[PDB]
Amino acid sequence: AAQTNAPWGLARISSTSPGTSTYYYDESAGQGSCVYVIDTGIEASHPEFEGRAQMVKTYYYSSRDGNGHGTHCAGTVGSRTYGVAKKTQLFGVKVLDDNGSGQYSTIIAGMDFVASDKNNRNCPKGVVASLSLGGGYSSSVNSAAARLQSSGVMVAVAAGNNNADARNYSPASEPSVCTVGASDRYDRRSSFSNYGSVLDIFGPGTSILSTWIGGSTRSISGTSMATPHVAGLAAYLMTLGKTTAASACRYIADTANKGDLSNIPFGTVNLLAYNNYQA
Ligand SMILES: [Ca+2]
Numbered sequence: 405a406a407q408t409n410a411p412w413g414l415a416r417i418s419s420t421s422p423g424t425s426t427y428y429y430d431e432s433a434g435q436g437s438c439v440y441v442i443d444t445g446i447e448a449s450h451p452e453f454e455g456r457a458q459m460v461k462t463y464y465y466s467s468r469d470g471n472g473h474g475t476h477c478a479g480t481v482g483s484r485t486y487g488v489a490k491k492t493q494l495f496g497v498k499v500l501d502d503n504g505s506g507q508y509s510t511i512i513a514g515m516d517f518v519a520s521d522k523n524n525r526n527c528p529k530g531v532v533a534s535l536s537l538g539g540g541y542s543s544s545v546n547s548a549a550a551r552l553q554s555s556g557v558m559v560a561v562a563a564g565n566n567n568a569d570a571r572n573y574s575p576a577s578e579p580s581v582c583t584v585g586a587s588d589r590y591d592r593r594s595s596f597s598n599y600g601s602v603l604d605i606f607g608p609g610t611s612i613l614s615t616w617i618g619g620s621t622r623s624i625s626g627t628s629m630a631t632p633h634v635a636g637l638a639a640y641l642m643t644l645g646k647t648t649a650a651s652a653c654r655y656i657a658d659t660a661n662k663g664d665l666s667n668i669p670f671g672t673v674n675l676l677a678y679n680n681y682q683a
Contacts (some may be wrong), residue, residue, distance in 0.1 A: 413612050429679060438527035438639070442534065446494060453615075459498065463510055475614075480633055489636040497514045510540065515548040516551065522556070529639075541572050559580075563583050591665050605656055660678075
């Protein structure tokens with residue numbers, strides 16, 4: 405399949421070079437996989453989700469996304485126009501309030517929720533979780549992310565937006581999950597992107613067009629935006645049978661575009677997520 409005039413990040417994920425505008429992908433498009441978006445919620449009624457999105461849990465007085473950031477992330481995972489895996493099922497877990505904040509205890513509860521909840525869903529091709537959030541180092545937060553991964557969920561987490569070593573942030577610093585840095589359309593490390601040995605991969609994170617609340621769309625930037633590209637890619641690859649939740653991060657790194665990013669600090673991987681799709 406070919407989607408012309410796609411957002412730059414989608415085009416980048418299916419290209420060996422920057423500067424193109426068509427997204428190429430296998431028509432299976434993540435069908436039979438599921439992705440949990442653990443965030444401010446998802447506006448499931450957005451036409452872009454085509455009935456494939458649903459809220460499954462909230463820790464607040466509503467499951468509505470009153471912020472937009474969860475909806476944006478979900479759109480990059482699996483919306484018809486803005487998504488990597490255009491046929492995946494999307495499950496929203498609202499651990500962040502409408503200001504985008506959340507107590508670590510709530511975030512941890514949300515991760516343990518997903519580890520159990522997947523047993524209540526039909527995801528024959530596999531399960532992914534996208535965590536576009538983080539804070540200071542916490543062994544408890546890292547342990548929760550590790551449990552989620554261990555349970556058989558491909559966990560992708562944002563590296564963080566501090567232009568600093570991600571070793572000091574959680575869940576970014578958890579070794580067993582897939583920690584995602586951000587790049588821009590000219591293959592530069594995004595100016596705000598964290599880095600360090602704990603990073604596994606980079607994805608598009610600067611000026612990313614996706615869904616927003618009120619049935620709208622929006623371009624925003626962050627490692628929060630890079631993470632769902634990788635989560636969607638994992639779901640897509642699992643549907644193709646190329647990899648599994650336990651090995652998807654390794655597979656993505658193995659098949660990434662290598663050495664193509666600029667301003668990657670010595671000691672950080674120079675790897676950009678790539679679907680290796682040959683039309
Ligand atoms: Ca890792």
